[PDB]
Structure 1
Amino acid sequence: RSAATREALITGARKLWGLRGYAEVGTPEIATEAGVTRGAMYHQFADKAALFRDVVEVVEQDVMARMATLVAASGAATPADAIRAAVDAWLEVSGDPEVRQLILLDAPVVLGWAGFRDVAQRYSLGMTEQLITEAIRAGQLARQPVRPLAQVLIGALDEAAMFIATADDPKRARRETRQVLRRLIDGMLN
């Protein structure tokens, strides 16, 4: 009922904002894409930013699912190779035009830095801490505090993706950034 309306609105908002950006699409156009009235939409979402918060949750769930599948697919043989594949998986997924627009460009603006940090960490800290713990257990990464390392790596990878997202030559930005991240990772791994 309400759940059907909310799911229609989130789907339509993800599609249209994914293509043209948060700033360029109003709630009435999203209501039309979804097949609901303005009244029904206003009942479910106070304002545009509330609908965007639910869009970011569903997109982040999909980002983390896709990254897990690419890492499972990579044929990584050790925890060190799992971390290298996880970095390749992030650059691949964050290079999706919808992810670029909603997560890398719009979410930091609409959510704020604190908001974006909270979402990024809520979705990514667990996977990141896991990869670090497995590398430490396999003797391929120095025993060190896991959470601070995970935090710093997430900040590095988020900034890498945002640099590529806004680069004048994104093809070259991506190749050069991937080399930077490999050197950084490889200096930690043994």
Structure 2
Amino acid sequence: HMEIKRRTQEERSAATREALITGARKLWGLRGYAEVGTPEIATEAGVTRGAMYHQFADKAALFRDVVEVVEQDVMARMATLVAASGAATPADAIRAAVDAWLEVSGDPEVRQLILLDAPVVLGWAGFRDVAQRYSLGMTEQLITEAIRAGQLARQPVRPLAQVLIGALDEAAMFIATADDPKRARRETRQVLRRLIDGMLNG
């Protein structure tokens, strides 16, 4: 008897939540978390303050869901760029994935939300857990494929993956906080080329 009512209220709640996340991603992406209040976000999203209260305990809870949706888009955008790269070998896929990370992390919205705001708002523990949840699988599979092809030494995948994600996250943070980010991106790309080319047999 009550399944349509329950599903209807679920769908309405989901639509409200999506509008708030979409609004918050847009305004915080342009001005930064510190500079935009939840009332402006509720106005942008076309929802009441009570609808906001119902969905999110507080401003940081809304930000935690923004980061989830952005990280899903970052991982999808990176997969698209590697897929489109023309990579002939697992080693070339790895190089395409590093290039994709510098391109996607360079998007001004990703820079603001993931590299500048997220470490501050989530705290160090929260940021590291999100980055590993989204990126460890892709990174490990790229390593497994290169090992299978004899382009990387046979070794435990997890330690290498975690160390490389540490290096790549700090590379992107360096570019994000540079006052001349075009020069920083060149210099950082050049470092990562030497690091990756030092490890790959191909």
Which TM-score band (shorter chain)?
A: over 0.9
Q: In 1, distance between residues paired with 2:185 and 2:84?
A: 21
User: Residues 5-16 of structure 1: matches in 2 within 5 Å?
Assistant: 5-16=16-27
SS in 2 for 1:181: helix
**Deviation per residue, 1:103-124 (Å, 9 max, x gap):** 0000000011110010000000
Partners of 1:27 and 1:150 lie apart in 2 by: 37
Match of 1:91 in 2: 102
SS at match of 2:147: helix
Cα distance in 1, alignment partners of residues 189 and 140 from structure 2: 21
Q: What's the CA shift string for 1:75-107, capped at 9, x where partnerless?
A: 011000000000000000000000000000000
Alpha-carbon distance, 1:144 to partner:
1.2
Offset of residue 59 of structure 1 = 0.4
Moved over 4 A (4+): none
Structure 2 distance, partners of 1:182, 1:145, is 22
TM-fit CA distance, 1:39? 1.1
Give 1 or 2 for the bigger CA radius of gyration: 2
Matching residue within 125, 138, 151 for 1:140: 151
Q: Distance in 2 between matches of 1:74 and 1:141?
A: 20
Deviation, 1:74, is 0.5
Q: Secondary structure at the match of 1:177?
A: helix
Q: Match of 1:58? A: 69
Equivalent residue of 1:75, what SS? coil
Unaligned runs of 5+ in 1: none
Structure 1 residue 40: Cα displacement: 1.0
Q: CA deviation at 1:180?
A: 0.3
Identity, in percent, stands at 100
Determine which of 13, 22, 26 is the counterpart of 2:33. Answer: 22
Shift of 1:4: 1.1
**1:9 Cα deviation (Å)?**
0.2
Q: Counterparts in 2 of 1:102-117, with a 5 A limit?
A: 102-117=113-128
Partners of 2:124 and 2:149 in 1: CA distance:
35
Shift of 1:153: 0.5
* 2:136 alignment partner in structure 1: 125
Aligned length: 190
CA distance in 2, matches of 1:128, 1:61: 15
Tell me the distance in 2 between the aligned counterparts of 1:66 and 1:75.
16
Question: What CA distance in whole angstroms lies between the structure 2 residues aligned with 1:36 and 1:169?
Answer: 39
Tell me the TM-score normalised to structure 2 length: 0.93
Measured after TM superposition, the shift of residue 168 of structure 1 is 1.6
Q: Which of 172, 196, 199 matches 1:185? A: 196
Shift of residue 145 of structure 1?
1.0
CA shift digits 1:148-167 (9 cap, x unpaired): 10001001000000100011
> Aligned-residue CA RMSD in angstroms?
0.5
Following TM superposition, by how much is the alpha carbon of 1:55 offset from its aligned partner in structure 2, in angstroms?
0.4
